[PDB]
From a paper:
Notably, the models from the 4 °C class II and 25 °C class A reconstructions have similar overall conformations (Cα r.m.s.d. ~0.6 Å), however local differences near the SF and the CD suggests that they represent two intermediate substates (see the analysis below). Compared to TRPV1C,RTx, the 4 °C intermediate state (TRPV1IC,RTx) exhibits rotation of the TRP domain while the C-terminal half of S6 (S6b) rotates and tilts away from the ion permeation pathway so that the diagonal distance between the side chains of I679 in the S6 gate is larger than 8 Å, consistent with an open conformation for the S6 gate. However, the SF of the 4 °C intermediate state adopts a nonconducting conformation, as there is minimal change at the SF with the diagonal distance between the side chains of M644 of 6.4 Å.
To address this question, we chose to study transient receptor vanilloid member 1 (TRPV1), which is the receptor for vanilloids and noxious heat. TRPV1 is a homotetramer, where each protomer has an N-terminal cytosolic ankyrin repeat domain (ARD) and a transmembrane domain (TMD) of six transmembrane helices (S1-S6). The TMD is composed of a voltage sensor-like S1-S4 domain (VSLD), a pore domain (S5, the turret, the pore helix (PH), the selectivity filter (SF), the pore loop (PL), and S6), and the amphipathic TRP helix. Vanilloid binding at the S1-S4 domain allosterically acts upon the pore domain, driving pore opening.
Residue numbers in the entry:
A (entry chain A): 114 to 126, 152 to 183, 188 to 223, 229 to 238, 243 to 602, 624 to 752
B (entry chain B): 291 to 579
Write the structure that this text describes.
């Protein structure tokens, strides 16, 4: 075999590699003319279809070798006279699918895909799926990397393959096909964060006369420099499969461009449509009930009985009856919040690494309801430590009231700033501040002998050095030291190091954040409103699920089979002067 | 040729071009001789010289240079292994980069006197920026977390033995038949041993570098602080055996200084490693003016 392999390598006329595959691989400038001889010799004596049996490169055949090399003539010769299941092509490796046509499409080889698709000797199957279930369009969308030229040719190839498949097979619906996981090419582009492919798919009009029915953004009329466009909105607002809007919003936040992935033509106005139509009165009746429950909880916490031990027997007074009713309403609200929070994590199962960075408002609403259930537990088992939990519940809830500024734009970017500092710029600076506080507090408490004023306490001396950070500390707070020149050196060093060097450095860090999330979070607020709209829509499913459905059913054209095309469209308008 | 370099796009361009041409021509006439290995009297090599003098352009050229020609390809560093599609995996030569008989490129860039212009971003060249990471992940992230833990476990031996010091009489203090006194004595011994270790680890560091005074505080600040901590406690040892009660004023300074030096170990974290670099720069520049 060495002479044959050596001659094939010389280009002179386990792994399981064949001479044809070896010859094709070891070809320079397409000079491997011995491949024809082997194929011709093989014909005189199944050989062309032989493939490597190695698990790493399982399934690779001659067609793949020629396709990779961009050889039109070699590909045509091989075709005229399979799927690579190897770990190299499964999700150092390159994924393109597991079909020759997917190899052609994923590499921009437009001519080769045309040749394969309508190859007279053997045509390829457009709708075939690999092991993962991905079709061709799934591979094309997966390959996307969000670059102007990259998005350019991926969208171009998608459009070309789509038109060609429609021309050969008008009946079949290619986009509706799904992989094993269940997603569609549009849903996949929405989930994976590929903004370019989503922007293409959502608003794509193909002008050609016959194959116009596979388009979304139509036109209704144009009198002058003005024209009103439609949209298709098929699986956008709601569908059997996951909707584009829900996927973008309920995404794990690992998706790159979630915040500004809603600026595409339909979504940015479909979201607004829902907000104005039937949600602005359900985000103002939910705010009012919360404001009316925090005056039932506050007024019943402020007038709690002070004499004796709990529980307290009722008295024949109107005040006591009202207090009992207030307590019942408060506890009912607490239980409702606890369940509304418990059955939210089961729906998402958010990862710990992003438990606080994506659901902060909900974590807080849950943590509030824990403190009050703990109070219910402690108050019936004859304890008076239930006040320390009711108080925390009250303060936490009043400060959670800020969650409802989610609707306002000017104020919705002010409760987004208090989430971001408390997470990023106030947990670093307390790792870098307690070090100084404890170092100098241990120093000072060790210097003083003390072996009343009672400044021999590591608690009192840690506290008194924290009032040097709010500018409310007495320098001569003790006189028990034996070495004044050291004590008043330590304090004066501490004041400079923390009051003047650390506080005035944390302010700069918060200033940078305030700029950043003051000129960026304008889209995070829109996203938060989008989640609010989605949850509000989900809550009232029983009431007006179908009744409050966006978009109107309209005729678009004629399905190629001969029937009529009716779809749920959303109308938009525009004005343009320079085009005429 | 490397010495003449001044780090300009066109300047780097023709210096690199001339270097490549002279190298190829010398290889063609004399393939046997290794020209780069030659050194001047000081001992440096052209690559080591480009690394020491701060010439980033020549270093970037030399580290990753592939010459495609068929015969004279053996004088190259950045090869290629395979390319299936739009993907290709490159190699590198890393001959005297990680370690060598002559000074390594990595050590020269790091242990430089800091007069070198571009030290901070002179490690972005192809090999170094990932070779450094390789070492970090492979066998150093568990030696910068066992060195942090021992320091955190020694500052709870020093603090707990400083906080419970005897208050009655004059030093030294005779031992008592109590478990508390034995534990205090052990804490003192451990603390003093740590102090001596730090003092020697600091004294034999300056001999290795002999840093200039003008850049004594601008390049070794973390080490100056670790040394100054160990001086205060050796002074305390000196004063405490010679029957004085002024050793508390030094032990206290040692304790505070060490707790605040704990910040040196945020060197590994990225988000927190740029917060202890800000407290060095203000205290030097914006709080002495
Ligand atoms: C009665 C109808 C209550 C349901 C309306 C609603 O969504 O409210 C809710 C409040 O309502 C309550 O929690 C109060 C429950 C007790 C009622 C006593 C006061 C009555 C005077 C409104 O709020 P929500 O949007 O349900 O949840 C807010 C927090 N998450 C869960 C969105 C993060
Ligand atoms: C025992 C092994 C000690 C060596 C490990 C090491 O590098 O530590 C060292 C600390 O270790 C000590 O200084 C403590 C020494 C006394 C031990 C008592 C506590 C035991 C419980 C770790 O720190 P380092 O990196 O050696 O130096 C940090 C400061 N410079 C010198 C790098 C600037
Ligand atoms: C940043 C640093 C954060 C934490 C480092 C923890 C190291 C603590 C070292 C122990 C010092 C010590 O002995 O303090 C003891 C404990 O001091 C305290 O009050 C609690 C110390 C925990 C502080 C952590 C924050 C002495 O108090 P006592 O013996 O209860 O009363 C005396 C009569
Ligand atoms: C910034 C510093 C601002 C104020 C600190 C004190 C002002 C310096 C005056 C020096 C004169 C002096 O030593 O005073 C003597 C007393 O000095 C002392 O008691 C200790 C002085 C140490 C203070 C300097 C340390 C500052 C360093 C901070 C970093 C005599 O006066 P008396 O005994 O108080 O009566
Ligand atoms: C993230 C969590 C678990 C958190 C829970 C409590 C303990 C909390 O302290 C923090 C940390 C903290 C503690 C003290 C001062 C600052 C920060 O922040 C909140 C948490 C911080 C707040 C308010 O936080 C906010 O920024 C309001 C807010 C911003 C954005 C939102 O979308 C939002 O919706 C609920 C609420 C108030 C407290 O809940 C409160 O009243 C008490 C007693 C402590 C505050 O821990
Ligand atoms: C540079 C030197 C010699 C220095 C030595 C001592 C006296 C020091 O005051 C300074 C000047 C000073 C004094 C008082 C307030 C601010 C600054 O800064 C440090 C020095 C400043 C510090 C902490 O300095 C830091 O920024 C921490 C740090 C930052 C970056 C690092 O790489 C680092 O590694 C060790 C440590 C704390 C003290 O050591 C301390 O605890 C006491 C009692 C004085 C501080 O002189």
């Amino acid at each position: 075999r060495r002479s044959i392999f050596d001659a094939v390598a010389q280009s002179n006329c386990e792994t399981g590699k064949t001479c044809l595959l070896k010859a094709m691989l070891n070809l320079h400038n397409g000079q491997n003319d011995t491949i024809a001889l082997l194929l011709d010799v093989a014909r005189k004596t199944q050989f062309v279809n032989a493939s490597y049996t190695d698990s790493y490169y399982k399934g690779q055949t001659a067609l793949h070798i020629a396709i990779e090399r961009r050889n039109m003539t070699l590909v045509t010769l091989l075709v005229e006279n399979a799927a690579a299941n190897g770990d190299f092509f499964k999700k150092p490796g390159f994924y393109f699918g597991e079909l020759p046509l997917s190899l052609a499409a994923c590499t921009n080889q437009l001519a080769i895909v045309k040749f394969l698709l309508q190859n007279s000797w053997q045509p390829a199957d457009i709708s075939a799926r690999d092991s993962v279930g991905n079709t061709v369009l799934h591979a094309l969308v997966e390959v996307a990397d969000n670059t102007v030229d990259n998005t350019k040719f991926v969208t171009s190839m998608y459009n070309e393959i789509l038109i060609l498949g429609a021309k050969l097979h008008p009946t079949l619906k290619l986009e509706e096909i799904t992989n094993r996981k269940g997603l569609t090419p549009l849903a996949l582009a929405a989930s994976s964060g590929k903004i370019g492919v989503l922007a293409y798919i959502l608003q794509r009009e193909i002008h050609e006369p016959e194959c116009r029915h596979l388009s979304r953004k139509f036109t209704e009329w144009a009198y002058g420099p003005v024209h009103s466009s439609l949209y298709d909105l098929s699986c956008i607002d709601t569908c059997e499969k996951n909707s584009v809007l829900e996927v973008i919003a309920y995404s794990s936040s690992e998706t790159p461009n979630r915040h500004d992935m809603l600026l595409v033509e339909p979504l940015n106005r479909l979201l607004q449509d829902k907000w104005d139509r039937f949600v602005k009165r359900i985000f103002y009746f939910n705010f009012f009930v919360y404001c009316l429950y925090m005056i039932i909880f506050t007024a019943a916490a402020y007038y709690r009985p002070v004499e004796g031990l709990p529980p307290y027997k009722l008295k024949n007074t109107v005040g006591d009856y009202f207090r009992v009713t207030g307590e019942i309403l408060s506890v009912s609200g607490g239980v409702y919040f606890f369940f509304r929070g418990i059955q939210y994590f089961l729906q998402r199962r958010p990862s710990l690494k992003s438990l606080f960075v994506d659901s902060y408002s909900e974590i807080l609403f849950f943590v509030q309801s824990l403190f009050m259930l703990v109070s219910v537990v402690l108050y019936f088992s004859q304890r008076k430590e239930y006040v320390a939990s009711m108080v925390f519940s009250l303060a936490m809830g009043w400060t959670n009231m800020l969650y409802y500024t989610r609707g306002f734009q000017q104020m919705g970017i002010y409760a987004v700033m208090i989430e971001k500092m408390i997470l990023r710029d106030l947990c670093r600076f307390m790792f870098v501040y307690l070090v100084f506080l404890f170092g100098f507090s241990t120093a000072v408490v060790t210097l003083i002998e003390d072996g009343g004023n009672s400044y021999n306490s590591l608690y009192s001396t840690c506290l008194e050095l924290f009032k040097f950070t709010i500018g409310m500390g007495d320098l001569e707070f003790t006189e028990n030291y034996d070495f004044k020149a050291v004590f008043i050196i330590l304090l004066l060093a501490y004041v400079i190091l923390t009051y003047i060097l650390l506080l005035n450095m944390l302010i700069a860090l918060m200033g940078e954040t305030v700029n950043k999330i003051a000129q960026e979070s304008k889209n995070i607020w829109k996203l938060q409103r989008a989640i609010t709209i989605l949850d509000t829509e989900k809550s009232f499913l029983k009431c007006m699920r179908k009744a409050f459905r966006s978009g109107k059913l309209l005729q678009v054209g004629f399905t190629p089979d001969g029937k009529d095309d009716y779809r749920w469209c959303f109308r938009v308008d525009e004005v343009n002067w320079t085009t005429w």
